[PDB]
Amino acid sequence: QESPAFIDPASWNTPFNGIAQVACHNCYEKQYANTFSSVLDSVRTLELDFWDQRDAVSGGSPHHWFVRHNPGGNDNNCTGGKNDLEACLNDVKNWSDKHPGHFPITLILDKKQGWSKESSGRTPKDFDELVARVFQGKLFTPQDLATHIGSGAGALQGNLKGKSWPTANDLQGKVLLVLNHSENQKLSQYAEARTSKAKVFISPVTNGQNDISGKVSGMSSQSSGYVAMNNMGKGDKSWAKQAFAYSHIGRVWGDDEVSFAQHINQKINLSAYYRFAAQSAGGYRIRPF
Numbered sequence: 001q002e003s004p005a006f007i008d009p010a011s012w013n014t015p016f017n018g019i020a021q022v023a024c025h026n027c028y029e030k031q032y033a034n035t036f037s038s039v040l041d042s043v044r045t046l047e048l049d050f051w052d053q054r055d056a057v058s059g060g061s062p063h064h065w066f067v068r069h070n071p072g073g074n075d076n077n078c079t080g081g082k083n084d085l086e087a088c089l090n091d092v093k094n095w096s097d098k099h100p101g102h103f104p105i106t107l108i109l110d111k112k113q114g115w116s117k118e119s120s121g122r123t124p125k126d127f128d129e130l131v132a133r134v135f136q137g138k139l140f141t142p143q144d145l146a147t148h149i150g151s152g153a154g155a156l157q158g159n160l161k162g163k164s165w166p167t168a169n170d171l172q173g174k175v176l177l178v179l180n181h182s183e184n185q186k187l188s189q190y191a192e193a194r195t196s197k198a199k200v201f202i203s204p205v206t207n208g209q210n211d212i213s214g215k216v217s218g219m220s221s222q223s224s225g226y227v228a229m230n231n232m233g234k235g236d237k238s239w240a241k242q243a244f245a246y247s248h249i250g251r252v253w254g255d256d257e258v259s260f261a262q263h264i265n266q267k268i269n270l271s272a273y274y275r276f277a278a279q280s281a282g283g284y285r286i287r288p289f
C-alpha cells in the first residue's frame, strides 16, 4: 500500500465513492506538465483528449487514436509524432507497474470525434480491445462494480443508490477508465455496443436529475442504466450532491477558482484543475469527505 504525503491515510478504508480527489484538467498538454507520467507525482486522476483523425478530416488509422487539444496529429507530453493514445495509456501502465500498491488511478478519456464504422477500426469494440491490451488485469470495470453491489451492469444507475463502492484498499493497483464526450449520444452508442462487457465507465454530461437517475439526455433508457459516474461543468456542479446521493462518481471541471476544500464541501469526488499541484486541503489532494 503506497503512502505519498498527498494521500490522507484515512482514504484507504473508505469506499471509493466516499473519497474526494484533486484531478487534472487536460494534463496531457505540455503547458500543464513536463511529462504525462509526472502528473502521478501529485494526483491519481488524469485526463486524455483523443481524436480519430490527424486533423478534423484526414489521417486516421485503424486501432489507433491521437492525443491533442485542438481539431488541427499528436500534441502532448506522453512518451514519444508516435506519442499517440496508446503511448499515453502505456505511460500510465508503466507507472502502475513501478508502484505496486498504488491508490487506484482514474483516467478520464475525453473523446473528441464520433465512433467509426467497422471498416475503419475505431468502433467501441476496437476501443475496448485497445484499452484491454494495454492494461490487462489492472482494469476495474462497470461489471466489476455491478458484481460488488449485487446488480446487473445495466442497472447500476439506480442500484448504486445506498451502496458503497469497493474501498481504495480493495482497489489498490487498479485503473478505472471513464469516457466523456460533449454529446451524450456517443456514450449511449458505446454502451449499446458493449453492454456488460464494457471496459470503460460512461460519464454523461449532467444538468438535471434525469442525467443521474432517469433517461439521460441524449441517451437511450438501456444505456442510461449503465451510468455510475456523472460529469459536470462549473455551472452544473450543484448536481454533484445528487451524484453523491446515488453513489455515482461525480466530476466537476472548469471551476478552478474554487478551492479543493470547497469542492469537498460540495460533495464532488473528482475536482479537475489545470494547476493541480497547487491544490490541496490540509496538505492532502486525496481524502474522505
Ligand SMILES: O[C@H]1[C@H](O)[C@@H](O)[C@H](O)[C@@H](O)[C@H]1O
Pocket: 025, 026, 047, 108, 110, 180, 181, 182, 231, 253, 272
Ligand atoms: O472540455 C471539457 C473538459 O475538457 C472536461 O475536462 C471534459 O470532461 C469534457 O468532456 C470536455 O468537453
Ligand SMILES: [Ca+2]
Pocket: 026, 047, 048, 049, 110
Ligand atoms: Ca479535455
